[PDB]
Enzyme design. Structure first.
Site, PDB file in Angstrom:
ATOM      1  N   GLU A 180      74.091  -5.039  64.707  1.00 38.92           N
ATOM      2  CA  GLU A 180      74.217  -5.210  63.252  1.00 38.92           C
ATOM      3  C   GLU A 180      75.616  -5.216  62.830  1.00 38.92           C
ATOM      4  O   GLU A 180      76.362  -4.746  63.452  1.00 38.92           O
ATOM      5  CB  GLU A 180      73.436  -4.879  62.019  1.00 38.92           C
ATOM      6  CG  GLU A 180      73.873  -3.502  61.788  1.00 38.92           C
ATOM      7  CD  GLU A 180      72.436  -2.584  61.006  1.00 38.92           C
ATOM      8  OE1 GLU A 180      71.244  -3.242  60.795  1.00 38.92           O
ATOM      9  OE2 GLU A 180      72.380  -1.563  60.772  1.00 38.92           O
TER      10      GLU A 180
ATOM     11  N   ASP B 129      78.258  -0.293  53.454  1.00 38.54           N
ATOM     12  CA  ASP B 129      78.570  -1.683  53.941  1.00 38.54           C
ATOM     13  C   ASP B 129      79.830  -2.301  53.452  1.00 38.54           C
ATOM     14  O   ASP B 129      79.893  -3.359  52.898  1.00 38.54           O
ATOM     15  CB  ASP B 129      77.531  -2.635  54.098  1.00 38.54           C
ATOM     16  CG  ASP B 129      76.082  -1.996  54.028  1.00 38.54           C
ATOM     17  OD1 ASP B 129      76.168  -1.273  55.060  1.00 38.54           O
ATOM     18  OD2 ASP B 129      75.225  -2.401  53.388  1.00 38.54           O
TER      19      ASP B 129
HETATM   20  O1  XYP Z   1      72.842  -4.583  55.493  1.00 35.53           O
HETATM   21  C1  XYP Z   1      72.739  -3.079  55.859  1.00 35.53           C
HETATM   22  C2  XYP Z   1      71.791  -3.251  57.191  1.00 35.53           C
HETATM   23  O2  XYP Z   1      72.770  -3.687  58.032  1.00 35.53           O
HETATM   24  C3  XYP Z   1      71.195  -1.829  57.382  1.00 35.53           C
HETATM   25  O3  XYP Z   1      70.356  -1.948  58.318  1.00 35.53           O
HETATM   26  O4  XYP Z   1      70.795  -1.217  56.080  1.00 35.53           O
HETATM   27  C4  XYP Z   1      71.292  -1.301  55.040  1.00 35.53           C
HETATM   28  C5  XYP Z   1      71.970  -2.635  54.527  1.00 35.53           C
HETATM   29  O5  XYP Z   1      72.690  -2.486  53.402  1.00 35.53           O
HETATM   30 CA    CA Z   2      79.651  -6.416  56.941  1.00 33.49          CA
END
Ligand code: XYP
Ligand code: CA
Length: 330
Positions: A223, A24
């Protein structure tokens, strides 16, 4: 197996660091150097991260420095576990580290930690940011001086349990023709550790100006939102989760609505995909991650970078992390 070895051989990026697992990546240019704020995946011999490091490239092409651990969940009183995808911002000579973590009662929220330098160390606030929930914060330093916080992630991220900033156990992810959920956006207060307003939903539209549908997993938000400015427009990019891409959309406003443009990153090795987009001197870059270093382990990743280009018409060409000719891992 051997399908992963092919991808490793044709990967366009090598892990920026290999002595620790990282994910990330949130890249920023602070004080003339490129600072990266990634998650720190831990190998228990399962996204149970507990701490954050800060990485730096002093100049373009430089070796990546591990500036060390800058925050641990033990110094975050409101959080129990799962220090996920973070981001950073600067204002008034301070550097703020924004991070999602889970409370003892299982709910994610976004906290902030303050430092006097980009490498920290950061002293976390005792409570999380009010008005925050879910995960994956991204803080945009607008050219006009304001700062905006973006957040959200469905499935494990819990955004599906909220409507109009309020939690309900019976709130579920929308389906079919119902509009898909979008990330949240809220202007930050000048003190940076509080929102200046309740968050609003960020709307992503299709070619026809219609909001993306819940059943459109190829394009709907999953996400890790990120916003950057270029050529007088705002670029919202994000992960599509189950379809494994980083997609992007554009708007003339930080609040949107954002019109879907296309795929920015093709599927990476490992289930998750997360990224940032940052201008460093003569070059825009895509920062991302995959699971090649760990041999395909979704929970043990490594961050990477690649040159990114905006075309004359504002569009961004798809980046293929193992080459365009590669067999996609997803
Ligand atoms: O924030 C991240 C998330 O988006 C993902 O789902 O899993 C890993 C995490 O670090
Ligand atoms: Ca981010």
């Amino acid at each position: 197996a051997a399908s992963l070895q092919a991808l490793a051989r044709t990967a366009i990026s090598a892990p920026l660091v290999t002595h620790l697992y990282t994910a990330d990546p949130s890249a920023h240019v602070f004080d003339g150097a490129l600072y990266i704020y990634p998650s720190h995946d831990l190998d228990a011999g399962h996204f149970d991260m507990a701490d954050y490091h800060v990485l730096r490239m002093a100049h373009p092409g430089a070796a990546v420095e591990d500036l060390g651990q800058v925050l641990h969940v033990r110094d975050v009183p409101w959080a129990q576990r799962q220090m996920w995808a973070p981001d950073a911002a600067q204002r008034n000579g301070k550097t703020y580290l924004y991070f999602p973590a889970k409370r003892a009662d299982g709910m994610f929220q976004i906290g902030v930690a303050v430092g006097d330098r980009p490498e920290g160390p950061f002293v976390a606030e005792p409570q999380p940011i009010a008005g925050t929930y879910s995960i994956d914060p991204a803080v945009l330093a607008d050219d006009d001086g304001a700062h905006y916080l973006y957040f959200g992630g469905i499935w494990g991220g819990q955004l599906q349990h909220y409507r109009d900033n309020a939690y309900a156990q019976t709130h579920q992810e929308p389906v079919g023709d119902a509009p898909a959920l979008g990330p949240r956006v809220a202007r930050l207060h000048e003190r940076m550790i509080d929102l200046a307003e309740p968050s609003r939903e960020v709307v992503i539209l299709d070619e026809h100006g219609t909001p993306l549908r819940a059943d459109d997993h190829a394009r709907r938000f999953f996400e890790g939102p990120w916003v950057h400015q270029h050529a007088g427009r705002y670029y919202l990019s994000y992960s599509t989760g189950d379809t494994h891409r980083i997609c992007y959309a554009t708007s003339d406003s930080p609040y949107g609505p954002f019109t879907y443009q296309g795929v920015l990153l093709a599927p990476v090795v490992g289930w998750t995909t997360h990224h940032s987009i940052c201008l460093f001197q003569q070059q825009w870059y895509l920062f991302y991650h995959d699971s090649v270093l760990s041999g395909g382990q979704t929970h043990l990743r490594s961050i990477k970078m690649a040159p990114l280009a905006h075309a004359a018409d504002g569009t961004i060409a798809t980046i293929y992390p193992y080459g365009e000719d590669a067999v996609s891992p997803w």
